[PDB]
Design a protein around this nucleic acid. Structure first.
Ligand SMILES: Nc1ncnc2c1ncn2[C@@H]1O[C@H](COP(=O)(O)O)[C@@H](O)[C@H]1O
Length: 529
RNA sequence: GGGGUAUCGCCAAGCGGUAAGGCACCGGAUUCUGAUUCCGGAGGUCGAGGUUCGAAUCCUCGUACCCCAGCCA
């Protein structure tokens, strides 16, 4: 429960409603992100819990900011998240003829007029946050003049900027949006749905309430910036022949630490190529979180956990992470990899290797076990071996043992380095029978696995507030480590996510893992205190 | 000017009855993942009043922060 669900209950009880019908209206001007996941869960979830319906409407009243590529994707992630919309996919453009008819009703009703003030002029006549606005000189044309002038616009008689249809409200209203907000503006551009049928397009406020009304939306849910805008939402409906009046309710938008949500900023990262695509694993997009290896179920859990309120908030990464962890920790099977390898060599070992039985999930034996190749020329991660240091350091020391993963307790007893004092091999002796702890991969059967380590895209918690958010990117957001993993991973499949023991949770894909180079994405590392 | 919001570190409940819940942090128990799991702790109701037996919840004066001056959504 949250404040919106309480309002829904009150109405259901008060008989104000007999069903709930919500909607998710993204403008197809970019890809969906974690913020849209919060909105998708709210709207689609509410509907399903309340045995109602929820529509997917692409608010496409601005041909110049949107592309078909986006509608294609939006649909994809909405589904991938586990949500189904009611009936066909909608579009504001479907109501483009209804809206025109409504603009004409307002006009006939004397509530709208073709203004001819330039764009700089409408701003000048607009007033300020404290000083009131002033009436346009064209404010009082006749219904005949307005009808005539509107069609003129529609026909293409007027140049872009040369004219716009305005609502005749109150130029001194403390609500700046009520200062004769524009209803229709001229754009000689092609629409991705209506082609070049319309040379005039409707503004958001005009289109939103009407679409909502036509679809029969009971509760229009949106973010807080549209609180003032609600005044125009109710005015439009109140002033036209429409049989329903959907009610708007605003909730705070999600803000995530070390990342940016603005489609404009996200777009920029994508435009300027500072990230691969909208699906780059460091992007907070849905396709991004997906390619990174997040589970729709973990996102829905995230959104569920963060709550819905009217308070500006900024969730820490830690929370998002806890979510994929709590999922993957229980469903992912363990594996063995070495991101930064250093060849160990048990001179004490004789043979061409053998095989050791390993589990698929330590606390879940019913997930089965497996056979893995052992040898005297195995690899380990550098950080595991230490020539010296502390009484807490539970790994390999230049004079002690350690239990290799699911295998033998080796015991270092030498080493060797190169011209730059960098080790190359570590000579140790395996206890004939033993089967701190560490993880390995035999060199003989070591698949050359490219491992991709991801980190926070930005170096500052609130990059958005930075003067140049781009200049504050994290150069180590993606560190590509070539490594070695067990031959098991020879049979990985994009979609499947395993937990490389002791490291993190990894998954294939990343748009790169060919048959030769199995590239892997590190979804999230483990709690490492 | 107008619209909103103020509960530990971050989120966020109890809506007149006396500080949930998640995440973060800090300790202890197990674990061939320093993980998991498991107990234990630290910290909070903007300020100043009023009402009340009692207020986080109602009333008020402050103050702080956010949004609004796109022919963007
Ligand atoms: N950062 C965000 N947090 C929460 N909801 C968001 C966020 N960004 C967009 N939305 C929701 O997604 C809808 C469609 O967004 P557009 O594509 O701008 C909005 O009307 C909001 O309900």
């Amino acid at each position: 429960t949250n404040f919106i669900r309480q309002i829904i209950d009150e109405d259901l009880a008060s008989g104000k409603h007999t069903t709930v019908h919500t909607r998710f209206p993204p403008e197809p001007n970019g890809y969906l992100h974690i913020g849209h996941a919060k909105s998708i869960c709210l709207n689609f979830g509410i509907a399903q819990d309340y045995k109602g319906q929820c529509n997917l409407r692409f608010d496409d009243t601005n041909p110049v900011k949107e592309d078909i590529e986006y509608v294609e994707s939006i649909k994809n992630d909405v589904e991938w998240l586990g949500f189904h919309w009611s009936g066909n996919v909608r579009y504001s453009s479907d109501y483009f003829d209804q809206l025109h008819a409504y603009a004409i009703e307002l006009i006939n009703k004397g509530l709208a007029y073709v203004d001819e003030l330039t764009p700089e002029q409408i701003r000048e006549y607009r007033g300020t946050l404290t000083q009131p606005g002033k009436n346009s000189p064209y404010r009082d044309r006749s219904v005949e003049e307005n009808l005539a002038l509107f069609e003129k616009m529609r026909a293409g008689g007027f140049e872009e900027g040369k004219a716009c249809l305005r609502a005749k409200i109150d130029m001194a209203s403390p609500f700046i949006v009520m200062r004769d907000p524009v209803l229709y503006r001229i754009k000689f551009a092609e629409h991705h749905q209506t082609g070049n049928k319309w040379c005039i397009y409707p503004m958001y406020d005009f289109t939103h309430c009407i679409s909502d009304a036509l679809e029969g939306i009971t509760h229009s849910l949106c973010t807080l910036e549209f609180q003032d805008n609600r005044r125009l939402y109710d005015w439009v409906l109140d002033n036209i022949t429409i049989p329903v009046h959907p009610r708007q309710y605003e909730f705070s938008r999600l803000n995530l630490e070390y990342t940016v949500m603005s489609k404009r900023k996200l777009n920029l990262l994508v435009t300027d190529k500072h990230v691969e695509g909208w699906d780059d694993p460091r992007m907070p997009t849905i396709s991004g979180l997906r390619r990174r290896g997040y589970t729709a179920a973990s996102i829905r859990e995230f959104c569920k956990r963060i709550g819905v309120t009217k308070q500006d908030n900024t969730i820490e990464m830690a929370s998002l992470e806890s979510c994929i962890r709590e999922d993957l920790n229980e469903n992912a099977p363990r594996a063995m990899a070495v991101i930064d390898p250093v060849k160990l060599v048990i001179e004490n070992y004789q043979g061409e290797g053998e095989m050791v039985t390993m589990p698929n999930h330590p606390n879940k034996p019913e997930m089965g076990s497996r056979q893995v190749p052992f040898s005297g020329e195995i690899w380990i991660d550098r950080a595991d071996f230490r020539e010296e240091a502390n009484k807490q350091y539970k790994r390999l020391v230049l004079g002690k043992e350690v239990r290799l993963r699911n295998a033998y307790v080796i015991k270092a007893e030498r080493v060797e380095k190169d011209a730059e004092g960098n080790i190359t091999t570590i000579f140790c002796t395996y206890d004939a029978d033993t089967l701190g702890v560490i993880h390995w991969v035999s060199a003989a059967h070591a698949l050359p696995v490219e491992i991709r380590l991801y980190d926070r895209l930005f170096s500052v918690p609130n990059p958005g507030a930075a003067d140049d958010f781009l200049s504050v990117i994290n150069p180590e957001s993606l560190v590509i480590k070539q490594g070695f993993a067990e031959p098991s991973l020879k049979d990985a499949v994009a979609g499947k996510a395993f937990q490389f023991e002791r490291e993190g949770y990894f998954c294939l894909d990343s748009r790169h893992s060919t048959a030769e180079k199995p590239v892997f994405n590190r979804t999230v590392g483990l709690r490492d205190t």
